[PDB]
Amino acid sequence: PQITLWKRPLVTIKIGGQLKEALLDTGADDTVLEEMSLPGRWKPKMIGGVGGFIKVRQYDQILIEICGHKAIGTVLVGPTPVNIIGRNLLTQIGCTLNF
Amino acid sequence: PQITLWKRPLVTIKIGGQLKEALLDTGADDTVLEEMSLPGRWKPKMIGGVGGFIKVRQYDQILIEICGHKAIGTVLVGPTPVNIIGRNLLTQIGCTLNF
Numbered sequence A, B: 001p002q003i004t005l006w007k008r009p010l011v012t013i014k015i016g017g018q019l020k021e022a023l024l025d026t027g028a029d030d031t032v033l034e035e036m037s038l039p040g041r042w043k044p045k046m047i048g049g050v051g052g053f054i055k056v057r058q059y060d061q062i063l064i065e066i067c068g069h070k071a072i073g074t075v076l077v078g079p080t081p082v083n084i085i086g087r088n089l090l091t092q093i094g095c096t097l098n099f
């Protein structure tokens, strides 16, 4: 698709068999989801946003569908205000910026 | 151009007589720049994102050039960790997400 930016680029994602709404965010290195449970081991990470730093849990090699496009990669979980899809997964689905 | 997302989408902007590096951020409602002087009236604003809220100065009707494309819009100025071009200006330069 082509997504214009007059509204927030919110899309449906599927993770763990469940649908969620998430923001396509070209300013995010990483994908960060609101508190939830994921299987497997996790490792710690500190990430920065516009307001400062947050602690998150890093899960690797997680299956996640974004606008119907299948990705498998790193998902961070922590106190983000919205589910954010960052560049690590935007590149997996072939996303570019165009103007 | 067509900008891929393997690295942060940083571009050159021209604003208030200055050349700066800024991040094209489809996740940001607003454009927020690190501390700088801008002409005219301003009012305080709180903006929130990852890590919480920061207080910024809101300047309206500010001319800007982003990667060679002219626009006008609101520019916020405050303690953001990086200069961020948000949707309010990305729309004006015809920026879309494509996959």
Ligand SMILES: CCC[C@@]1(CCc2ccccc2)CC(O)=C([C@H](CC)c2cccc(NS(=O)(=O)c3ccc(C(F)(F)F)cn3)c2)C(=O)O1
Binding pocket: A008, A023, A025, A027, A028, A029, A030, A032, A047, A048, A049, A050, A051, A081, A082, A084, B023, B025, B026, B027, B028, B029, B030, B031, B032, B047, B048, B049, B050, B051, B081, B082, B084, B086
């Ligand atoms: C996972 C962190 C993502 C990010 C990283 C910024 C960064 C980049 C390089 C180095 C250091 C830091 C980019 C980003 O879009 C935001 C948020 C949106 C999720 C953001 C950015 C800019 C302004 C705002 N405030 S706002 O009022 O314009 C606003 C508020 C809320 C939302 C919502 F969509 F997230 F709800 C979008 N915009 C928020 C942020 O807080 O940090």
Ligand SMILES: [Cl-]
Binding pocket: A072, A073, A074, A088, A089
């Ligand atoms: Cl990844």
Ligand SMILES: [Cl-]
Binding pocket: B072, B073, B074, B088, B089
């Ligand atoms: Cl505006």
